[PDB]
Structure formats: structure tokens, C-alpha cells
């Protein structure tokens, strides 16, 4: 009769309009809960050292669980055992950076290439200014950027990761599903560092840029990012 | 129907309102406003009657058309922009005109037009510069002001008045409004010492003058 079939199509248009509304209340609430949990996780790593200075003991904080690994040296003249590693962290060009969670089985791997990297331990801000700005996806062996939540929610719906701020809570605090959001992130494309490195070859101890630098790596992401 | 009330929240930054949608719900009072529920044209003939058609079909197509183009969002025609100033320019200041055939005369500012350009009127007895539009970019601001708020500027003069039409001859209304403004402006600048020869002389560089050194 073509009187009812109109209204039946309008029911499907209204049910999804309500489904976008009940997904835009959810991402806002999953973000506010995290904004509370980051205050609580920063202040409580101060409070144990103020109570440990009232008595006179010391509070050693736990060793961190996340490192940020940048390659600085070239493709030419490379040791074969090295180049396998730098192709097991997916660092193919120069100036590529990744996020690596830490354990005993990956410190000794990041020890053998100390002359080629400069790794650290990143702050909370320099994870935002790497996901929001230089953060591209990996959809079907391609490289598709991130302009919506639905580009994440296709390839990560099986882990209750439905936005960007859940992927950030996962990386900052390393959740169970870290592998399925770090093989997904394409390797980053940083630029040349402004101002200038000191000297590429040597260690950061004797005035270089390689080797460990535990919280000076945010002075190399605010410079390069 | 119903009067158009002003927008309830104010503006905090460009884009961001100062009230959220919760204090705005109760501010709007959305607790008590629930809501629940041509081409054919005939004509006579003085046979029969004839039915004409509006906007009739063409008589000649070209051999090839060009396609439609896409839609952006933030592109306005020129008459719908925003208008800006600098910081230093006020009505009553003294300017240094640069690029006309009035090269380098020290002149006096009046106002900002609706199109952007300035209303720069020298006293015609001094600098031979009448009411004349110039542009804001090409004008160096000399920090030397006079009072202006005791004038009665006419309301018919605008960009439609200075705008080109097509030898030449001067219309008598240019001579009128030039004399009418100058007979009110001129006693203000005459009563300041050493100014009627200042507006008069020209700016020029010389050896031992660098523009980044003197402040003006």
C-alpha cells in the first residue's frame, strides 16, 4: 500500500540514531572514570615517600613496565644479528619509534643494539601527542589513519576496546591485551630532531644520544614529535 | 510566533560555551515544555482555451556539459566577512600615506569603512589631500592624536560614494563635504602648536636614518 513501508523504514533510521546516542554517553563515561584513576595513580606514588620520610626509611618505587625505543642509525653497514632484531621490533627506516613492554626477556634483546637506539620511559603527555598526531592504523596490510572510533572498533571489538582512550589506558597501564593493540599500530614516522643531537655514536652517559635515558626521552619527543 | 529571545549561554572562548547541558536544561526550563503528538497555467483566448507551461524545455543542447562540483563548508563571499583593525589606529590619529600619487604626505584618519578601507582626509588647504579612501596595509601610524568626538560626520558618504563609475571633472558635492568637514576639523589642528607646517611637510629618508632605529 506504500503507507506502512515508509514508517517501517523510519523505524530503522531511528533505532540507529538512538544507538549513536547510547554510544556517545558511553565513551564520555569511560573517559571520566580514567581521568579519576590517573590522579589516584600519580598521587599515591608520592604519599608513600612522604610517610616514609616521616619515619626515616625510604620508598623505592616499582620499576616501570614500558619503554619507548627510537632508532637513530642507518641501514648501511649493519651486523646481521642486529638487523634481525631491528626487524623483530619492526624498525626498518631511520628514526622509527615503538612502544615495548618490559621484562627480562626483552631487556637482553635491547642490550645488544645499544649503539643504534636511544630508549627511555615516556610520560603521559607524550603518549597523547603520539597517538593523536602521528598515529596511523594498520587495516588489511595497509596504512589507514584514525579519524573515528569505528576504525578501532572493527579490529578490536573482541577486547572491549571501543575508542582511543581505552587504547591509551591499555598502553599506559599495560593491560592484558597489549599485543593486539601494538601489532595494530603501524610504526611511527617521526621527523628530524630540531636543534641537533650531540653525537650519534656514543652513549648518553659520556655526552651522546644512545643508550638508556630514563626520563630525558621526553626531551627528545618534544623536540622530534 | 513567540519572540526571539537572546542566546542563553554567553561565549567563553570561540566555540565553547560557559554552561553545560545540565545547567542549561534547568536554565531553559525544559521541565515544563514537554512535546507529544504552478507549472500548469491556463489562459483564455478572445478555438478554446490554452494551457501554457512555465519554464519550458530547451531548444538547443551543447555537445558536452561539465559536471557538478562538490560542497565545502566555510567559504563566504566578500561582503560577509569579518572586519579587523590594528591595535594602534584610533580616530583622530596622524598617518603617513605612502603609495599613491600623494607620496608621503602626513595625513589624518577619520574612520573605518564597512568594506575595510580607511577614510583619510587631509585638510585641503594644507596638504592638498581631500576626503580620500586608502588601505590599512600601506599606512604607517605616527603616534600623534587629536580629539575627534565633537564632529558631525555625514551619513550619505560610504564606499558607494567613492566607487568608480566607468577626462574627469570634480562634482560639487565633493567640494561641499570637503568644506563641511574641514571647517570643523581645522580649528582643532590649528590650535596645537607647530602642526600646520607639520602636516604640510613630507617624510623622506636620508643618510644616517634607519627605520628600525627611530620609533614612530
Amino acid at each position: 500500500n506504500f503507507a506502512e513501508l515508509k514508517i517501517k523504514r523510519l523505524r530503522k533510521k531511528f533505532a540507529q540514531k538512538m544507538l549513536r546516542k547510547a554510544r556517545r554517553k558511553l565513551i564520555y563515561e569511560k573517559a571520566k572514570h580514567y581521568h579519576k584513576e590517573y590522579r589516584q595513580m600519580y598521587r599515591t606514588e608520592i604519599r608513600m615517600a612522604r610517610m616514609a620520610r616521616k619515619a626515616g626509611n625510604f620508598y623505592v618505587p616499582a620499576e616501570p613496565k614500558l619503554a619507548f625505543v627510537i632508532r637513530i642509525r642507518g641501514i648501511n653497514g649493519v651486523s646481521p644479528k642486529v638487523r634481525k632484531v631491528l626487524q623483530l621490533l619492526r624498525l626498518r627506516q631511520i628514526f622509527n619509534g615503538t612502544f615495548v613492554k618490559l621484562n627480562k626477556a626483552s631487556i637482553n634483546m635491547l642490550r645488544i643494539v645499544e649503539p643504534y637506539i636511544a630508549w627511555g620511559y615516556p610520560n603521559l603527555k607524550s603518549v597523547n601527542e603520539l597517538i593523536y598526531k602521528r598515529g596511523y592504523g594498520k587495516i588489511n596490510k595497509k596504512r589507514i589513519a584514525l579519524t573515528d572510533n569505528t576504525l578501532i572498533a572493527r579490529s578490536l571489538g573482541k577486547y572491549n576496546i571501543i575508542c582511543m582512550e581505552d587504547l591509551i589506558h591499555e598502553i599506559y597501564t599495560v593491560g592484558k591485551h597489549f599485543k593486539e593493540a601494538n601489532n595494530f599500530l603501524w610504526p611511527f614516522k617521526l621527523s628530524s630532531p630540531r636543534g641537533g643531537m650531540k653525537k650519534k655514536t656514543t652513549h648518553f652517559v659520556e655526552g651522546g644520544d644512545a643508550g638508556n635515558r630514563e626520563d630525558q626521552i621526553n626531551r627528545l619527543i618534544r623536540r622530534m614529535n | 510566533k513567540g519572540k526571539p529571545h537572546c542566546s542563553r549561554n554567553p561565549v567563553l572562548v570561540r566555540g565553547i560555551g560557559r554552561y553545560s547541558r545540565s545547567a542549561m536544561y534547568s536554565r531553559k526550563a525544559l521541565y515544563k515544555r514537554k512535546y507529544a503528538a504552478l507549472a500548469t497555467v491556463t489562459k483564455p483566448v478572445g478555438g478554446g482555451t490554452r494551457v501554457v507551461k512555465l519554464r519550458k524545455m530547451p531548444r538547443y543542447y551543447p555537445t558536452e556539459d561539465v559536471p557538478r562540483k562538490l560542497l565545502s563548508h566555510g567559504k563566504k563571499p566578500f561582503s560577509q566577512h569579518v572586519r579587523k583593525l590594528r591595535a594602534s589606529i584610533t580616530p583622530g590619529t596622524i598617518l603617513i600615506i605612502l603609495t599613491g600619487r600623494h607620496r608621503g604626505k602626513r595625513v589624518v584618519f577619520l574612520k573605518q569603512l564597512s568594506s575595510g578601507l580607511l577614510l583619510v582626509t587631509g585638510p585641503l588647504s594644507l596638504n592638498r589631500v581631500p576626503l580620500r579612501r586608502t588601505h590599512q596595509k600601506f599606512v604607517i601610524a605616527t603616534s600623534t592624536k587629536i580629539d575627534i568626538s565633537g564632529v558631525k560626520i555625514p551619513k550619505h558618504l560610504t564606499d558607494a560614494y567613492f566607487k568608480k563609475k566607468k577626462k574627469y571633472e570634480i562634482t560639487e558635492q565633493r567640494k561641499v563635504d570637503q568644506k563641511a568637514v574641514d571647517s570643523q576639523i581645522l580649528p582643532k589642528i590649528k590650535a596645537v602648536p607647530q602642526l600646520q607646517g607639520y602636516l604640510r611637510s613630507v617624510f623622506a629618508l636620508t643618510n644616517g636614518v634607519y627605520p628600525h632605529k627611530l620609533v614612530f
Binding site: 533505532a15 538512538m18 544507538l19 547510547a22 554510544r23 558511553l26 | 514537554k34 512535546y35 507529544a36
Partner: peptide, 19 residues
């Protein structure tokens, strides 16, 4: 309320409180 299979009645009763 999120996934469309279960909370359809919840958005139903919200449609029969919003008017």
C-alpha cells in the same frame, strides 16, 4: 544499554518516557 541485542527494550522505555 550499548549492544543492540539486549537493550532494545531499554531504549524502548526511554522512547516511552521522552515524549
Amino acid at each position: 544499554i550499548a549492544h543492540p541485542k539486549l537493550g532494545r527494550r531499554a531504549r524502548a522505555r526511554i522512547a516511552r518516557g521522552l515524549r
